[PDB]
């Protein structure tokens, strides 16, 4: 079953209010010029990986990391598919020691969704419209475009309450208070 951890600074936020703030600041990747666009980084495999990590293309700190079995179809349909088990949001993505093939991490982790079971399929013979209806694609691509609503709809359809503040949300627990951030 999906569970959540959150940094105490976000105790008064909900999933919906957090993802709105995150996505607004991440901003729409399509509006970034090519020269400064972060298209995201796959690692863990020899356009696929067990981790996909992406930061804002607009010189803001927001970033996201997905872990699971992730794939991207590139040209011409640009569909994200596979399985996301863990989805994490925060700020200031950095490459792990050993470089990009070792993965990335967020310097500040705000919210982590565990056992999210977010999936989608890709069929190379089907239309782009059909392939883009998958839960994983619409939610990840929406977030990349500054739009959390597809992700929120997927979460609501899983029975997750995206309205409750984290402090009151049964499936969420606060990361222990620390002092290094
Ligand atoms: Na709670």
Segments making up each domain of the chain, as ranges:
1-181
> Do β-strands 80-95 and 104-114 pair in parallel, antiparallel, or remain unpaired?
antiparallel
Using CA atoms of 135, 112, 7, 162 in order, give the dihedral in degrees to the nearest 10. 30
Rounded to the nearest angstrom, the distance between the alpha carbon of 178 and the centre of ligand 1 is: 18
Rounded to the nearest angstrom, the distance between the alpha carbon of 11 and the centre of ligand 1 is: 8
Rounded to the nearest angstrom, the distance between the alpha carbon of 138 and the centre of ligand 1 is: 27
Q: Provide CB contacts within 8 A for 160, sequence distance 6+.
A: 2, 15, 171
HSE at residue 71, side-chain half, CA atoms within 13 A, is 14
Q: Tokens in use for 113?
A: 């969704």
Are the CB atoms for 73 and 36 separated by under 8 Å?
no
Helix pair 15-26, 149-157: axis angle to 10 deg: 150
Q: How far apart are CA 92 and CA 85, in angstroms?
A: 22
Taking residue 161's Cβ as centre, other Cβ atoms within 10 Å add up to: 15
Number of residues that this document lists for the chain: 181
Ion ligand 1 residues within 5 Å by Cβ: 169, 172
**What is the SS3 assignment for 163?**
coil
**Max Cα distance, the chain (Å):** 53
Angle at alpha carbon of residue 67, lines to 6 and 4, rounded to 5°:
20
Q: How far apart are CA 94 and CA 28, in angstroms?
A: 21
Are the CB atoms for 2 and 119 separated by under 8 Å?
no
Rounded to the nearest angstrom, the distance between the alpha carbon of 4 and the centre of ligand 1 is: 9
DSSP 101: G
Instruction: Provide the β-strand partners of residue 109.
Output: 90
In the PDB record, what is the listed experimental method?
A: X-ray
Resolution in A: 1.1
Cα dist from 122 to 35, 84, 156, whole Å: 29, 14, 23
Q: Tokens in use for 17?
A: 């209010």
Rounded to the nearest angstrom, the distance between the alpha carbon of 173 and the centre of ligand 1 is: 5
CATH number for domain 1-181, candidates 1.20.1050.10, 3.30.1500.10, 3.10.25.10, 2.170.190.11: 3.30.1500.10
**How many angstroms separate the first and last alpha carbons of the chain?**
30
């Amino acid at each position: 079953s999906t569970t959540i951890q959150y940094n105490s600074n976000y105790a008064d936020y909900s999933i919906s209010s957090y993802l709105r703030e995150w996505a607004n600041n991440f901003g729409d990747i399509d509006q970034a010029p090519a020269e400064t666009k972060d298209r995201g980084s796959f690692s863990g495999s020899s356009f696929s990986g067990t981790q996909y990590a992406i930061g804002s293309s607009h010189s803001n700190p927001e970033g996201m990391i997905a872990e699971g079995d992730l794939k991207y179809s590139f040209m011409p349909q640009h569909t994200f598919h596979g399985q996301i088990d863990t989805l994490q949001f925060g700020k200031d993505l950095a490459t792990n020691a050993g470089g990009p093939s070792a993965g990335k991490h967020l310097e500040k982790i705000d919210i982590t969704f565990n056992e999210l079971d977010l999936s989608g399929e890709f069929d190379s013979g089907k239309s782009m419209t059909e392939n883009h209806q998958g839960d994983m694609h619409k939610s990840v691509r929406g977030l990349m475009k500054g739009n959390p609503d597809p992700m929120l709809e997927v979460m609501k359809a899983k029975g997750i309450n995206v309205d409750t503040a984290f402090k009151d949300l049964s499936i969420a627990s606060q990361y222990p208070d620390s002092g290094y951030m």
